[PDB]
Amino acid sequence: GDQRFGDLVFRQLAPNVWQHTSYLDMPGFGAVASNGLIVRDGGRVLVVDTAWTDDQTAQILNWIKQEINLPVALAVVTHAHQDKMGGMDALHAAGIATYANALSNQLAPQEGMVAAQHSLTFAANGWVEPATAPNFGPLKVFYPGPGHTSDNITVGIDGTDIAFGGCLIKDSKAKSLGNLGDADTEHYAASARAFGAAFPKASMIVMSHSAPDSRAAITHTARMADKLR
Ligand SMILES: O=C(O)c1c(F)ccc2c1O[B-](O)(O)[C@@H]1C[C@H]21
Ligand SMILES: [Zn+2]
Protein backbone atom coordinates (compact mmCIF):
# COMPACT_ATOMS: atom_id res chain seq x y z
CA GLY A 1 0.00 0.00 0.00
CA ASP A 2 2.93 2.33 0.65
CA GLN A 3 4.99 3.47 -2.33
CA ARG A 4 8.53 4.51 -1.47
CA PHE A 5 9.70 7.30 -3.79
CA GLY A 6 13.11 8.65 -2.88
CA ASP A 7 12.92 9.66 0.77
CA LEU A 8 9.12 10.12 0.64
CA VAL A 9 6.16 7.73 0.92
CA PHE A 10 2.90 7.88 -1.06
CA ARG A 11 -0.25 5.93 -0.19
CA GLN A 12 -3.43 5.78 -2.25
CA LEU A 13 -6.47 6.40 -0.05
CA ALA A 14 -9.22 6.60 -2.69
CA PRO A 15 -9.42 6.44 -6.50
CA ASN A 16 -8.56 10.16 -6.70
CA VAL A 17 -6.73 10.74 -3.36
CA TRP A 18 -3.20 9.99 -2.16
CA GLN A 19 -1.35 10.77 1.05
CA HIS A 20 2.15 12.23 0.80
CA THR A 21 4.60 11.62 3.64
CA SER A 22 7.96 13.27 4.28
CA TYR A 23 10.44 13.09 7.13
CA LEU A 24 12.60 15.54 9.06
CA ASP A 25 15.06 14.50 11.72
CA MET A 26 14.47 17.19 14.30
CA PRO A 27 16.82 17.25 17.30
CA GLY A 28 14.85 15.99 20.30
CA PHE A 29 11.97 14.44 18.32
CA GLY A 30 13.54 11.83 16.08
CA ALA A 31 12.70 11.62 12.40
CA VAL A 32 9.13 12.94 12.32
CA ALA A 33 6.74 11.92 9.54
CA SER A 34 4.40 14.59 8.20
CA ASN A 35 1.45 13.84 5.93
CA GLY A 36 -0.52 15.83 3.40
CA LEU A 37 -2.83 15.03 0.51
CA ILE A 38 -2.89 14.94 -3.29
CA VAL A 39 -6.30 15.00 -4.99
CA ARG A 40 -7.10 14.52 -8.67
CA ASP A 41 -10.15 16.54 -9.73
CA GLY A 42 -10.86 15.83 -13.38
CA GLY A 43 -7.87 17.07 -15.36
CA ARG A 44 -6.31 18.92 -12.39
CA VAL A 45 -4.34 17.98 -9.27
CA LEU A 46 -4.82 19.77 -5.93
CA VAL A 47 -2.35 19.54 -3.04
CA VAL A 48 -2.91 19.90 0.71
CA ASP A 49 0.24 20.87 2.66
CA THR A 50 3.85 21.00 1.56
CA ALA A 51 6.53 18.63 2.72
CA TRP A 52 9.01 19.81 5.36
CA THR A 53 11.42 21.26 2.80
CA ASP A 54 11.58 22.76 -0.66
CA ASP A 55 13.55 19.77 -1.97
CA GLN A 56 11.01 17.28 -0.61
CA THR A 57 8.14 19.34 -2.00
CA ALA A 58 9.76 19.33 -5.45
CA GLN A 59 9.90 15.54 -5.07
CA ILE A 60 6.14 15.48 -4.43
CA LEU A 61 5.69 17.37 -7.69
CA ASN A 62 7.99 14.86 -9.41
CA TRP A 63 5.89 11.96 -8.10
CA ILE A 64 2.73 13.70 -9.35
CA LYS A 65 4.27 14.17 -12.80
CA GLN A 66 5.29 10.50 -12.98
CA GLU A 67 2.18 8.89 -11.45
CA ILE A 68 -0.64 11.26 -12.48
CA ASN A 69 0.81 13.51 -15.20
CA LEU A 70 -1.70 16.35 -14.84
CA PRO A 71 -1.03 19.97 -13.85
CA VAL A 72 -1.15 20.95 -10.19
CA ALA A 73 -3.78 23.70 -10.18
CA LEU A 74 -3.35 24.84 -6.58
CA ALA A 75 -2.10 24.00 -3.13
CA VAL A 76 -3.60 24.88 0.24
CA VAL A 77 -1.51 24.75 3.42
CA THR A 78 -3.06 24.24 6.81
CA HIS A 79 -1.01 26.49 9.14
CA ALA A 80 2.28 28.40 9.41
CA HIS A 81 4.63 25.70 10.72
CA GLN A 82 7.41 23.91 8.85
CA ASP A 83 5.70 20.53 8.42
CA LYS A 84 2.83 22.20 6.53
CA MET A 85 4.45 25.25 4.93
CA GLY A 86 8.20 24.57 4.75
CA GLY A 87 8.13 23.88 1.00
CA MET A 88 6.22 26.95 -0.18
CA ASP A 89 9.08 28.21 -2.35
CA ALA A 90 9.07 24.94 -4.32
CA LEU A 91 5.39 25.41 -5.13
CA HIS A 92 6.05 28.97 -6.25
CA ALA A 93 9.03 27.93 -8.35
CA ALA A 94 6.71 25.43 -10.07
CA GLY A 95 4.13 28.12 -10.87
CA ILE A 96 1.44 26.68 -8.58
CA ALA A 97 -1.18 28.99 -7.08
CA THR A 98 -0.95 28.79 -3.29
CA TYR A 99 -3.52 29.44 -0.56
CA ALA A 100 -3.47 29.67 3.23
CA ASN A 101 -5.58 31.15 5.99
CA ALA A 102 -5.01 34.92 5.99
CA LEU A 103 -3.70 34.52 9.55
CA SER A 104 -1.20 31.89 8.39
CA ASN A 105 0.11 34.32 5.77
CA GLN A 106 0.39 37.07 8.38
CA LEU A 107 2.29 34.75 10.76
CA ALA A 108 4.50 33.18 8.10
CA PRO A 109 7.50 35.56 8.26
CA GLN A 110 7.86 35.37 12.05
CA GLU A 111 7.53 31.57 11.90
CA GLY A 112 10.32 31.38 9.30
CA MET A 113 7.88 30.45 6.53
CA VAL A 114 7.21 31.96 3.12
CA ALA A 115 3.60 33.17 2.79
CA ALA A 116 1.20 31.70 0.29
CA GLN A 117 0.19 33.90 -2.64
CA HIS A 118 -3.50 34.04 -1.68
CA SER A 119 -5.34 34.39 1.62
CA LEU A 120 -8.42 32.46 2.68
CA THR A 121 -10.93 34.17 4.91
CA PHE A 122 -13.61 32.45 6.95
CA ALA A 123 -17.21 33.09 7.92
CA ALA A 124 -18.11 33.28 11.59
CA ASN A 125 -19.30 29.65 11.46
CA GLY A 126 -15.89 28.48 10.22
CA TRP A 127 -16.57 27.72 6.56
CA VAL A 128 -14.25 29.37 4.06
CA GLU A 129 -15.63 32.39 2.24
CA PRO A 130 -16.09 30.86 -1.24
CA ALA A 131 -14.77 33.86 -3.18
CA THR A 132 -11.38 33.36 -1.49
CA ALA A 133 -11.15 29.66 -2.48
CA PRO A 134 -11.88 29.71 -6.22
CA ASN A 135 -11.53 26.48 -8.19
CA PHE A 136 -11.11 24.35 -5.07
CA GLY A 137 -13.23 21.60 -6.64
CA PRO A 138 -14.03 18.95 -4.03
CA LEU A 139 -11.89 20.57 -1.31
CA LYS A 140 -14.10 21.90 1.49
CA VAL A 141 -12.06 24.15 3.78
CA PHE A 142 -13.13 24.67 7.39
CA TYR A 143 -11.62 26.69 10.22
CA PRO A 144 -12.61 24.77 13.38
CA GLY A 145 -11.34 27.30 15.91
CA PRO A 146 -7.97 27.62 17.61
CA GLY A 147 -6.40 24.34 18.66
CA HIS A 148 -2.95 23.10 17.71
CA THR A 149 -2.45 26.70 16.54
CA SER A 150 -4.70 29.73 16.25
CA ASP A 151 -4.58 29.55 12.42
CA ASN A 152 -5.09 25.76 11.92
CA ILE A 153 -7.51 24.88 9.11
CA THR A 154 -8.96 21.55 7.95
CA VAL A 155 -10.09 20.12 4.62
CA GLY A 156 -12.76 17.62 3.61
CA ILE A 157 -12.81 15.95 0.20
CA ASP A 158 -16.31 16.00 -1.24
CA GLY A 159 -17.33 12.75 -2.91
CA THR A 160 -15.09 10.69 -0.63
CA ASP A 161 -15.16 9.53 2.96
CA ILE A 162 -11.96 11.47 3.73
CA ALA A 163 -11.33 14.51 5.90
CA PHE A 164 -7.95 16.00 6.84
CA GLY A 165 -7.29 17.39 10.28
CA GLY A 166 -3.63 18.36 9.87
CA CYS A 167 -1.86 18.81 13.15
CA LEU A 168 -5.09 19.43 15.06
CA ILE A 169 -5.98 15.70 15.12
CA LYS A 170 -3.90 12.89 16.64
CA ASP A 171 -4.59 9.21 16.20
CA SER A 172 -6.96 7.16 18.37
CA LYS A 173 -4.05 5.61 20.33
CA ALA A 174 -1.91 8.75 20.69
CA LYS A 175 -0.36 9.38 24.10
CA SER A 176 -0.26 13.17 23.80
CA LEU A 177 -1.36 16.13 21.73
CA GLY A 178 2.16 16.65 20.38
CA ASN A 179 3.60 20.15 20.05
CA LEU A 180 1.43 22.54 22.07
CA GLY A 181 3.91 25.43 21.83
CA ASP A 182 1.51 27.60 19.81
CA ALA A 183 -1.69 25.88 20.96
CA ASP A 184 -4.89 27.33 22.40
CA THR A 185 -5.34 24.88 25.26
CA GLU A 186 -8.73 26.14 26.44
CA HIS A 187 -10.40 25.87 22.98
CA TYR A 188 -8.65 22.76 21.62
CA ALA A 189 -11.32 20.23 22.58
CA ALA A 190 -14.14 22.29 21.06
CA SER A 191 -12.09 22.83 17.91
CA ALA A 192 -11.42 19.11 17.47
CA ARG A 193 -15.14 18.40 17.92
CA ALA A 194 -16.07 21.18 15.48
CA PHE A 195 -13.87 19.52 12.84
CA GLY A 196 -15.79 16.28 13.35
CA ALA A 197 -19.15 18.06 13.11
CA ALA A 198 -18.12 19.86 9.91
CA PHE A 199 -17.40 16.53 8.17
CA PRO A 200 -19.89 14.07 9.69
CA LYS A 201 -19.70 11.69 6.71
CA ALA A 202 -15.91 11.31 6.86
CA SER A 203 -15.02 7.83 8.07
CA MET A 204 -11.32 8.13 7.16
CA ILE A 205 -9.53 10.80 9.15
CA VAL A 206 -6.15 11.84 7.79
CA MET A 207 -3.75 13.78 10.01
CA SER A 208 -0.21 15.14 10.06
CA HIS A 209 1.75 12.65 12.17
CA SER A 210 -0.03 9.28 12.10
CA ALA A 211 -1.54 6.96 9.51
CA PRO A 212 -5.20 7.49 8.52
CA ASP A 213 -7.57 6.41 11.25
CA SER A 214 -11.25 6.07 12.04
CA ARG A 215 -13.27 8.85 13.66
CA ALA A 216 -11.97 7.58 16.99
CA ALA A 217 -9.02 9.85 16.22
CA ILE A 218 -11.39 12.81 16.63
CA THR A 219 -13.06 11.60 19.81
CA HIS A 220 -9.75 10.58 21.38
CA THR A 221 -8.07 13.87 20.46
CA ALA A 222 -10.98 15.83 21.94
CA ARG A 223 -11.03 13.71 25.08
CA MET A 224 -7.30 14.30 25.61
CA ALA A 225 -7.86 18.02 25.01
CA ASP A 226 -10.63 18.03 27.64
CA LYS A 227 -7.81 17.64 30.20
CA LEU A 228 -6.07 20.85 29.07
CA ARG A 229 -8.92 22.88 30.59
O1 LIG B 1 1.77 18.44 15.08
C1 LIG B 1 2.48 18.27 16.13
O2 LIG B 1 1.88 18.16 17.26
C2 LIG B 1 3.98 18.35 16.10
C3 LIG B 1 4.75 17.59 16.98
F1 LIG B 1 4.09 16.69 17.83
C4 LIG B 1 6.16 17.64 17.07
C5 LIG B 1 6.81 18.55 16.21
C6 LIG B 1 6.08 19.36 15.32
C7 LIG B 1 4.64 19.27 15.23
O3 LIG B 1 3.98 19.97 14.41
B1 LIG B 1 4.31 21.50 14.18
O4 LIG B 1 4.01 22.21 15.38
O5 LIG B 1 3.42 21.88 13.09
C8 LIG B 1 5.81 21.40 13.79
C9 LIG B 1 6.73 20.56 12.89
C10 LIG B 1 6.70 20.28 14.42
ZN1 LIG C 1 2.08 23.08 13.77
Ligand SMILES: [Zn+2]
Ligand atom coordinates in the same frame (compact mmCIF):
# COMPACT_ATOMS: atom_id res chain seq x y z
ZN1 LIG D 1 2.62 18.96 13.13
